Amino acid sequence: RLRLQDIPALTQDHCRMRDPAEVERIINEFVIGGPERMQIVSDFDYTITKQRTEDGGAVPSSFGIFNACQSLPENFKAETDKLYHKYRPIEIDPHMPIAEKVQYMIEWWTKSGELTSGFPFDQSEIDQIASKYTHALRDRTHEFFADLQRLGIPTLVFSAGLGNSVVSVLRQANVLHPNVKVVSNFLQFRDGLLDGFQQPMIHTFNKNETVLNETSEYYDLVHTRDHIIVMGDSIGDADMASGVPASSHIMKIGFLFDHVEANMKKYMDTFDIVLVDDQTMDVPRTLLSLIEKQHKLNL
Ligand SMILES: C[n+]1cn([C@@H]2O[C@H](CO)[C@@H](O)[C@H]2O)c2nc(N)[nH]c(=O)c21
Ligand SMILES: [Mg+2]
């Protein structure tokens, strides 16, 4: 039986667990179950991309990648910057109830969509920008996605960001394998012009059962997958799989980098494993390797 003290990646100082015995139990369940029961649901911005780079270069968000493109109206990045100035403080307000935050985030994504309308746009601009950031993914991301593909594990990248940017980055990093799907806000085009974003709207606080559930198209791909790894860097990522009705065991992994001491309690109450300044996929990959080892024995 697997014991945490025998799993090196989980014994490191930066791996924090509120209840190590529960984490150990969940791991043993995933290993008993095999890869055929597993699915992954992961955030993109600052989960798949790094929170901290080695060379100190900045990493933009998926929206930032879009805003860096050259063929935007001269008005554009300034106007989105204004909207950011208004709504970002609200997004991170520590006192505001989630219901109020949700009203405001709906406003932000709506207005952002309305700005992103009325002019033509070539996806290749996005590709040119995204190409500069394929070197900014977490260490061993390539190996992680290769493991998932080899094991046939469905992997959903569930992002409140700009989907076209997410897809461009993953595709160019050679990790957008057939088992990987992206649910996000994609640019809508009509008669050759941008027309905002394709519904449904996905913002920071509805990445849950109200968007991803048993009526979703994606559900048919994963309805037999009751063991889930959920990965993200925000508290708002912890519910990404809440709409999967027959899940039996979920391991929630949170990457914590900003304001570590202030956020530590909340993160440890929300995630099963909290990874403090861990710019690698070595912990998720550890889980996959133990699942695969047993799969091989059973074969
Ligand atoms: C509509 N919106 C949300 N975010 C930000 O993207 C993050 C990742 O999903 C969100 O946390 C939010 O701060 C935006 N950023 C920019 N630059 N422009 C936007 O229109 C925008
Ligand atoms: Mg994120």
Author numbering: 13 to 311
The publication says:
To gain insight into the broad substrate specificity of cN-IIIB and especially its unusual preference for m7GMP, we determined crystal structures of Drosophila melanogaster cN-IIIB (DmcN-IIIB) bound to different reaction products.
The final model of the DmcN-IIIB m7G complex contains two molecules in the asymmetric unit with one continuous segment encompassing residues 13–311 of molecule A as well as residues 13–312 of molecule B, both superposing with a root mean square deviation (rmsd) of 0.86 Å for 288 common Cα atoms (residues 13–103 and 115–311). After all amino acids had been placed, additional density was observed in the active center, which, based on its shape, could be assigned as an octahedrally coordinated magnesium ion, the co-crystallized product nucleoside m7G as well as a metal fluoride transition state analog. The overall structure of DmcN-IIIB consists of two domains: the globular core domain and a smaller cap domain. The cap domain packs against the top of the HAD core and is composed of two regions, a C1-type cap (red) and a C2-type cap (blue). The co-crystallized reaction product 7-methylguanosine (m7G) is bound between the cap domain and the HAD core and is represented as stick model (carbon in yellow, nitrogen in blue, oxygen in red).
